[PDB]
A = this chain, B = another copy of it.
């Protein structure tokens, strides 16, 4: 099933290097700029978006009017929300880097996050554009055997659950 996943534009915490999950921060000026560049670059398919403001705003500026689903949210970092990546305990860094065995206190485990995301993707009955977050795109890319790190405001199209079709980045 052809699915286009879009990572929302940047927020201040991208440059600041802080974990941003369920914390609701707005797009920066550049983030809105990145979002506008997506208009006319994404297929005119039904759109779905995380309910987080930054995701919804990206969809809007991209020319879409998506249906909202919290299932498309970034992983819930719990007590690690807002924590600087730099000072993150090596155990957490490793868990996130290897994408496994991550269970932040007060948050969502990586295993639970993957189930949520993959369960949502399984329910899609037709090609769609999904406005979501870096961790969601990463989970999908890694499940498809590829490095799952993509720039804010970029997109990837996949033939779920078989292979990646294209990675789209705009300058």
* Closest B residue by C-beta to A128: B143
Alpha-carbon gap, A67 to B110, bound state (A): 10
Tell whether A125 is near chain B: CB-to-CB under 8 Å: yes
Interface string of A54-69 (1 = CB under 8 A from B): 0000000001110100
Asked if A44 is at the interface (CB within 8 A of a chain B CB), the reply is yes
Is A145's CB within 8 Å of the partner chain B?
yes
Within 8 A of B (CB), among A30-71: 43-47, 63-65, 67
Q: Which one of B2, B64, B121, B144 contacts A100 once the chains associate, using CB atoms below 8 Å?
A: B64
State in angstroms the CA–CA spacing of A47 and B115 once bound together.
12
Contact of A127 among B99, B125, B161 (CB under 8 A): B161
Number of residues on chain A facing chain B (CB within 8 A): 33
Q: A125-B121, A125-B122, A145-B43 are in contact. Are A111 and B67 (CB under 8 A)?
A: yes
Taking CB atoms, residues of chain B closer than 8 Å to A119 are 125
* A118-B125 contact given A45-B143, A65-B100, A161-B1, CB 8 Å threshold: yes
A15 interfacial contact with B, CB 8 Å: no
A24, chain B: closest CB distance, angstroms: 22
